[PDB]
Design a protein around this ligand. Structure first.
Ligand SMILES: O=C(O)CNC(=O)C(=O)O
Ligand SMILES: [Mg+2]
Ligand code: NI
Ligand SMILES: [Zn+2]
Length: 331
């Protein structure tokens, strides 16, 4: 078995290997990359996402989210308070202000220590989940707005034609902005490109050990667990690496820098934080190996998780028994 310790793997494709996205994903899996839950892909030196980022300041963040924490430093939840709209230029200035800017630090490890020590005492503002793309239309390789769609994959594998669309999302971050422990909708893959700015640190649990994380989360968040049998679908809970180590949960960590791709694999729980002002783009995707994970994915039916139009069909076709109850949650 390849990669039996489930380490995060880093890949350096050539320009020729960068042509066929599906084929390269399948290559990475042949080397065991999926066992970690997360892989890094450094694009060939000839490649670029677009020519410059000089003209992005007028993009609107219609609903910036203030991420307010509750709990203890290593075990907390966050809720998202909606703020007034602002442009990317206005948000960048805010991220760079004395109130919100990255503190002085020695290296990524020192900054990680400061994040876990101090996150809860601040409420950074995240421009998340903004439909759109910063890939130039002429970028033909690994252009996250030109991938094969999940609906077309399901049709190719299973023969059933379904409604729905699949488009990318932009994330504008600042110091301490945080993504809670989750897997993707329907335990899909994700791909994330860091277009610009400061780094993003990731934590990941191997898919084969995901239920260990879930059992810890039920212990650490006991009211949430009674409220919903899949409450990590709410995307609100944080657990630090120190707490994970104390409870014997297998995980790995890595820092993504500007110009790099990350791929999360089906049922790979991940969480993380931004180091400072940045912009990422991400989308879900599927391969043939996903189908079995989609059929087994947990679902939130309590009403909290509320998701896209396009998840309807996936539930309806892959999980017909769950469909009725899940749809009641969505309505
Ligand atoms: O970058 C973020 O805030 C969160 N992104 C993801 O969870 C992802 O790409 O799967
Ligand atoms: Mg603009
Ligand atoms: Ni994700
Ligand atoms: Zn729920």
């Amino acid at each position: 078995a390849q990669n039996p310790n489930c380490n995060i793997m880093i890949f350096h494709p050539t320009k020729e290997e960068f042509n066929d996205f599906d084929k390269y994903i399948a290559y990475m899996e042949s080397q065991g990359a999926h066992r970690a839950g997360l892989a890094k892909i450094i694009p060939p030196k000839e490649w670029k996402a677009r020519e410059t980022y000089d003209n992005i300041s007028e993009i609107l963040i219609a609903t910036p989210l203030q991420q307010v924490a509750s709990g203890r430093a290593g075990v907390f939840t966050q809720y998202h308070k909606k703020k007034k709209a602002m442009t990317v230029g206005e948000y960048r200035h805010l991220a760079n202000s004395k109130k919100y800017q990255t503190p002085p630090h020695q290296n990524f490890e020192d900054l990680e220590r400061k994040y876990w020590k101090n996150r809860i005492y601040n409420s950074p503002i995240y421009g998340a989940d903004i439909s759109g793309s910063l890939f130039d239309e002429n970028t033909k390789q690994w252009n996250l707005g030109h991938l094969g769609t999940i609906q077309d994959l399901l049709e190719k594998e299973c023969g059933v034609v379904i409604e729905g669309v699949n488009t990318p999302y932009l994330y504008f971050g600042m110091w301490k902005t945080t993504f809670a422990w989750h897997t993707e909708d329907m335990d899909l893959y994700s791909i994330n490109y860091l277009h610009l700015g400061e780094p993003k640190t990731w934590y990941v649990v191997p898919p084969e050990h995901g239920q260990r994380l879930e059992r810890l989360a039920r212990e650490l968040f006991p009211g949430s667990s009674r409220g919903c049998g899949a409450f990590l679908r709410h995307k609100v809970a944080l657990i630090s690496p120190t707490v994970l180590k104390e409870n014997g949960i297998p995980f790995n960590r890595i820092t993504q820098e500007a110009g790099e791709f990350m791929v999360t694999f089906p049922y790979g729980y991940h969480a993380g934080f931004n180091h400072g002002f940045n912009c990422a783009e991400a989308i879900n995707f599927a391969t043939p190996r996903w189908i079995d994970y989609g059929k087994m994915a947990s679902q939130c039916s309590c009403g909290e998780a509320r998701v896209t139009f396009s998840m309807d069909a996936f539930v309806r076709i892959l999980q017909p028994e769950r469909y009725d109850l899940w749809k009641r949650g969505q309505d």
